[PDB]
Every structure is written in C-alpha cells, then in structure tokens.
C-alpha cells in the first residue's frame, strides 16, 4: 500500500520471493524443505514425538536423521 511519500510501502526492494515448502507437511515424510518454522516444521514429520507414527522416515532416507532432517521443533519433547 503506497503511502503519501510517493514510495511503495512495503518497498519492493526490501521484499523478495523465497521458495516455499512442499504440501508434504504432516505426511509423516520428513523432508528438509518443510522442516522449518515457516511451515509448522513439516507439520511434525521430522520429530519422532510429533509424527503420528511415532517414528520419523526421512524423504529420501539418505537425508541424515541428525542433519537438516533432525527434529527442529523446540516444542517437541526431544528438544526438552
């Protein structure tokens, strides 16, 4: 919404498009892209306590269970 100062607010230069996360949140598939605070940390697919199966399967399995596919949700009991 442009203000009265003849400048766009928020400024388009300050705004940028970042690749989003896949619709795989909450599918029990722990992919690194969805495992972010931006989208519910993959809906809990990357934390064992959060996933409804109570076991995390990385997608693909080559992803390290302690790397980007590790439980990144602080609210999870594993972080506690």
């Amino acid at each position: 919404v442009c203000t009265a100062g003849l400048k766009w607010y928020p400024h388009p230069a300050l705004i940028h498009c970042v690749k989003g996360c896949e619709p795989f949140m909450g599918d029990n598939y722990c992919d690194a892209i969805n495992n972010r605070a931006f989208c519910n940390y993959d809906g809990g697919d990357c934390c064992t306590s959060t996933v409804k199966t109570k076991k995390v399967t990385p997608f693909p399995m080559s992803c390290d269970l302690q790397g980007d596919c590790a439980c990144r949700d602080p609210q999870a009991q594993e972080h506690s």
Partner: protein, 168 residues
Amino acid sequence: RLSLQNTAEIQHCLVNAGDVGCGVFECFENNSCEIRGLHGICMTFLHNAGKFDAQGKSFIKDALKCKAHALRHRFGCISRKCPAIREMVSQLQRECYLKHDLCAAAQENTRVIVEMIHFKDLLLHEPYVDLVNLLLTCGEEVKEAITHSVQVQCEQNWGSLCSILSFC
C-alpha cells in the same frame, strides 16, 4: 506352499508395520514364494522420488500407500499356493498404478525411470516385470525409451545372447 509360521510372521508384520515406509514390504521379502525386490522397490524408489518431479512424488507416495494398504487388507483367505500370491501381488501393483496414473508420471520422468531400471533387476524379480510391462503400455515415446534402455543393459550383460533372443 507358504509356511504357516511365515504366514503368522507376515500378518504380525502387516498389523505392526504402518502404511508409510518400507515396513510393510520389508517383511514380505525372504518369503517362501520368492517374490523379491519389494524392499528394493521401496528403498530405490524412495531414493529416487526426489529426482521425480512434484507430481512424480505425489504419485509415488500415493502408489506406496495404495500398495501397503491394499496388500494388507486383501491378504485374507487366499490359498496357500504361491502362484495365487504372485497373481494377486501383480493385480494390486497394476491396480494401484492405474488408479494413480503411473503412465503420465512416467512420461514426465522417462529418463529417471530409465536410470533406476536395471537388467539384473528385471531378470530377478516379477514385480519390476509388472512395472516394465505396464511401462511399455504408457506412451509411445516412453515405451520407446524403455525398449532402448532395456536393449542397452540387456546387451551389456548378455552380449550376443540379447541380440539372438531379440530376433527382429
């Protein structure tokens, strides 16, 4: 001819293993019926689903879920004979593939599936046989690429045997 203890342990695995993952098809391996590669199917295609596009990932997840769920549910009062087991496994595979549009997803990723398919894999297991049989029925360009690939690896591992079997 499947052993009764084998039947008990497979049904225990199925009631224990969830829909997602290789757990359903992991126990199905090492059975008396010698239908192998199911664990290999899950392992390799979950390796390579990332190489598949987004629609490919959706299709592969849907197909894995369909296979696990249906093969668990319909594993009921089938006779002890292995040929019936192989027939129903092939039927479930083809049913999940047709209901989840294997053909177009394969068309979008012909090169990837060419990469996974191996001459030894088709020589060893009937599941991959069913997959490639349906693949040759999923698009003229797709079937042509699959034929080229299978000829390449078949002649690589067979030499003149592949040519003499492929008469014309």
